Design a protein around this ligand. Structure first.
Ligand SMILES: Nc1nc2c(ncn2[C@@H]2O[C@H](COP(=O)(O)O)[C@@H](O)[C@H]2O)c(=O)[nH]1
Ligand SMILES: Nc1nc2c(ncn2[C@@H]2O[C@H](COP(=O)(O)O)[C@@H](O)[C@H]2O)c(=O)[nH]1
Ligand SMILES: Nc1nc2c(ncn2[C@@H]2O[C@H](COP(=O)(O)O)[C@@H](O)[C@H]2O)c(=O)[nH]1
Ligand SMILES: Nc1nc2c(ncn2[C@@H]2O[C@H](COP(=O)(O)O)[C@@H](O)[C@H]2O)c(=O)[nH]1
Ligand code: NA
Ligand code: NA
Ligand code: NA
Ligand code: NA
Ligand code: NA
Ligand code: NA
Ligand code: NA
Ligand code: NA
Lengths: 337, 337, 337, 337
């Protein structure tokens, strides 16, 4: 029996947030910092919950040192060496509280990560990523990492439904990475037919996490600050971004109209440059992106957009955005000429 | 609890007006003038209820002097000086009954407006505009302007839902400006995720105004005369337009294929040229538009379109259009080659 | 009260015809000729019910002489003179049974038509066209033409709903022309907001005609032979076409890549060349179309397509197509690369 | 009575497959081979159920010799001669178990096929194709072929609904070819208005076959490996492909940016090169396609995609994919820049 779910699954383009009444005079009143206490690691975090994705070109140390100035976060890419990290530590000690070390489920990866966590005790976040986030093999791996590092906060993914968000949390992960399909350079939908609309995946997964006192990252699929806001509005605790951060000076890669090469974690460009075949669910794209320059401007644009959103729905802090969010269903997002 | 309204919100593209039986021989029979009596100012107005928007390039004095010849209206941009206005008065006294002076919620703006209303008693309309039309701060500001000018008619905005249309009317505004998102150079949807489909916003807001014996302007989102007609058909008492009036000789700005620069009230181009950051809900676009020449032709095209609409639905006067309007839901608006 | 009909109105793109079981070996078995007896004129017609539209460039005498060889029909454009027609009669007497003379509702038009019907008794069809097919003025005009020519068959239009199809038939018209909006060079939707999806307009109007033993033409909106088939399948008794016949050698106008100018009946190009302002509901477009050459090939393509349709649904004659038509609702019509 | 089925018929773009929990470590665990026993021929087949379509350019002997190395299948085009086939047999004896000989319903075709089956007893599949797969003439032809070759497995088509799938199976065909409209170079929808969405046609037809212990091919409409997976997920026993195999070295036709000419079975290019008028339901297109080079890479890409799909839904073998398939309804398939 092949069956078809009756419920149309919407994405970001299919909706808008409705404005509401409030006493908020203007957007600089709004506080975008959140304070979280994690279910399993028992650690506490405070910052602006926007994470740079652990992709080759954007999850760099340079990107980190800027984000951190804004209390934002960076999931560092897994190809840096131990020596690379010990220089990062020496150079930017104040940044270590705002980064996560990354690993796949392979033994070599686990060992290298371990050497990093031991050499840099200030790093207190771990980001774990596989091709099939629904595998029992990932479940037992998450148990292993939890046992090895009982006081480190664990981000794990990726999934799109709530049964697997609960199983991953109950198996020791703190923050589940929700998203398969929508990523700017993800090709699961084309290559495999498998995936989920981003908005629907957050609505559905956020509820499942929060009943366990766990948390989620909306990973992928945001194309402008409005999407970030919708992602938060849908219940996401953090939002992670690759494509919106691609193209800047603090991105790794030469400038080539000035452009830069933006490529997926499991892309052909990636496999050539490195053992990444089964790191993500699809062999992602390799695109050319216009050179945007310094990431500060982009950060300002994004945070500013999000402050307005909160103001316009009556949220004085980011914590209250999902509480105040009413989405309306629309037939369009743009007025063309 | 993030929730999603079950009702799909349609816009202008999603519908058509149905023709109906009548005794109307032709479109020159139709009278497009309306006579209004305002709830709070208690003043009476007669004209063709189509308003040029208070944008830098289109809300000019030159635009005004043409519109006025057609009994149309112009919301003048807020950057003109007192001296500029006193020349407008001297030069085009017969036009003063067909313009509104504009202001934001800042004290400097209020003072400059006040000096203008005192120096030109013939100006009897006020247009008030903010970034967050749902703020309690806007509500109290509207009370202040009402108290300062008890015999001036007040347009205030912008909103998209009826609870705020009622609160603004009950707080002293006469005519509520309805529209957030659809404007040709508005970027709220992209930058903030917040907005509303224009047609749905008028249907919903018109009902709310009219129960209080108040009035609304459909502000933004019309791309052709058909949209104007639909806007009126949905219940709007006036319709305001920026983009359809952009590009003409009576527009402010040099001619540059001949083009002209059309930019938003809170756009980057605006901030550079002037203190406009929080005048509108978004930092609007700056587009190039083809030089259309004299606004008379455009006016003729638009009024002509609207006369046909009334004829085809059986409305001998514009007053009867919403009464006679049945919208049908469609899957398209164009026959491509 | 502005209201919105709950029923989504589909067009040709939104549907497909379902194949069905039959004993039909192949498409040359299918007979596309119909025999009609008209309600009010009491005349009988036999032919392939596909009519060339009465547009300047396609409703020519040259087009007629080809169509007629295929038992197809031509609604001749209203600008030809009496002398022009008397040469047509002399030259192509066998074609006169397959054409209609055209007129608007003006007295000059009526007189010129009258002179034509008197000078050419073999012409037994009249085509009457106005801007507002819902006007009481059109209703009384139809009564007048019926009384003046009691044995001529009258095509009248255009409408999209059944209440007006019945009133026009009961007022003496034989064949109602159904379609407002979808025409290739019609601009009602853009200029006035008024119109109707073609498929929905035929479904709805065909039922209304046939209960009175009257007939309809699906006028406008077909872009390929599939649309013709759907139009017939929806219940239409005839289908009229402009754009699909545009571009051929037998079209009026010079060749200019080789192109030809195709323009609407009430278009600016039309008004310049001639008193046509209120002949159709909109001031239609003027497009450039590629030179297709001889209309024979196009005719062959269209008739062939329609024979296959009948075969694939089990209709041995065109009469049985609507009887055998089941439409399925689809989300697309094309497989792009 | 023209009527409209209430059920919207979805295609591949309208859905995604949902990931599910499993114990599958990775995609090389998945077995894509199936073992089938046919209802009427009583023969058994084992291989990867992906068939190259019997089109001029892709159903070649060269294509066959590669496919066969991958346990894939090739429906050979019907224009090869007896002598051509006897060389194929001599050269690639091990491939004969993985090809089908093709024929239309004409006597010449039947005779030539017969001479081939007699000269090459190793060929045990027959592929039969007509313009109207719903004709009683096709039904009796299928009876004739069954009687002539009682131990050959018969693929017959094409249809889209289950009443005709059952009648063709009960009349002796083994494997019904399901698909009319979606094919990359099919024009039925444009030329005739007749067709069916591919996904809906498989869902509906698969059920009908399987109740008779028969089988179906999803013929046409796949544009990437995701579509293949969805096709299998919907219940299809095999999937046939033309366009995805077009463009390779083992395709027939010269290289011309390097391109190759890809044309339909009943296309104008086909009729010119050969008696094919009524072989398929439409006169298909002739497109230019980029030269992809060797078909091995494409095969690897497609099989790899399909292994991931099975892994991500928890299917260790292709047999279990439809059993494990839950489709979700979506509003999009792509993230544009
Ligand atoms: N399946 C797949 N996902 C990728 C690949 N590269 C990056 N991603 C995903 O894309 C996400 C970011 O999405 P974006 O913000 O660019 O839309 C990353 O966090 C990661 O989840 C890849 O090669 N394959
Ligand atoms: N949010 C926003 N709205 C603008 C800006 N500039 C103009 N608008 C809106 O656009 C309206 C006109 O819309 P239009 O007729 O061009 O679609 C104006 O009345 C105003 O409400 C801007 O910079 N930001
Ligand atoms: N409203 C309007 N309709 C036109 C005009 N010119 C042609 N048409 C319509 O277009 C029809 C043919 O549509 P087509 O087959 O090109 O889609 C004609 O029969 C007529 O009803 C025009 O200028 N204005
Ligand atoms: N109606 C029609 N179908 C064709 C023609 N040529 C190929 N096809 C269909 O297209 C199918 C392959 O579809 P594709 O994989 O290219 O989308 C073939 O198996 C066949 O069923 C043609 O000329 N007319
Ligand atoms: Na491991
Ligand atoms: Na980059
Ligand atoms: Na103030
Ligand atoms: Na302008
Ligand atoms: Na008259
Ligand atoms: Na023409
Ligand atoms: Na035969
Ligand atoms: Na090819």
């Amino acid at each position: 029996m092949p069956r078809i779910d009756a419920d149309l699954k919407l994405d970001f383009k299919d909706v808008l947030l409705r404005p509401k009444r409030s006493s908020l005079k203007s957007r600089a009143e709004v506080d975008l910092e959140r304070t979280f206490t994690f279910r399993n690691s028992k650690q506490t975090y405070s910052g602006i919950p926007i994470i740079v994705a652990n992709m080759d070109t954007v999850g760099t140390f340079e990107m980190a040192a800027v984000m951190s100035q804004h209390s934002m976060f960076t999931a560092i890419h897994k190809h840096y060496s131990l020596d690379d990290w010990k220089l990062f530590a020496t150079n930017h000690p104040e940044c270590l509280q705002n980064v996560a070390v990354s690993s796949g489920s392979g033994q070599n990866d686990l060992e290298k990560m371990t050497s990093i966590l031991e050499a840099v005790p200030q790093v207190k976040f771990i980001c774990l990523d596989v091709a099939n986030g629904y595998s029992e093999h990932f479940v037992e791996f998450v148990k292993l990492v939890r046992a090895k590092f009982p006081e480190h906060t664990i981000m794990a993914g990726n999934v799109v439904t709530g049964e697997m968000v609960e199983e991953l949390i109950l198996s020791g992960a703190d923050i589940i990475k929700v998203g398969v399909g929508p990523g700017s350079v993800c090709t699961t939908r084309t290559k495999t037919g498998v995936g989920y609309p981003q908005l629907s995946a957050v609505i559905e997964c956020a509820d499942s996490a929060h009943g366990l006192k766990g948390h989620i990252i909306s990973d992928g699929g945001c194309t402008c600050p409005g999407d970030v806001a919708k992602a938060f509005g849908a219940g996401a605790d953090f939002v992670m971004l690759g494509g919106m951060f691609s193209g800047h000076t603090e991105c790794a890669g030469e400038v080539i109209r000035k452009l830069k090469l933006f490529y997926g974690m499991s892309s052909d460009t990636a496999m050539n440059k490195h053992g990444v075949a089964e790191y993500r669910a699809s062999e992602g794209k390799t695109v050319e992106v216009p050179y945007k320059g310094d990431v500060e401007n982009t950060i300002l644009d994004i945070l500013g957009g999000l402050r307005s959103t909160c103001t316009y729905v009556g949220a004085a802090k980011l914590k209250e955005l999902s509480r105040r969010a009413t989405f309306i269903r629309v037939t369009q997002q743009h007025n063309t000429v």
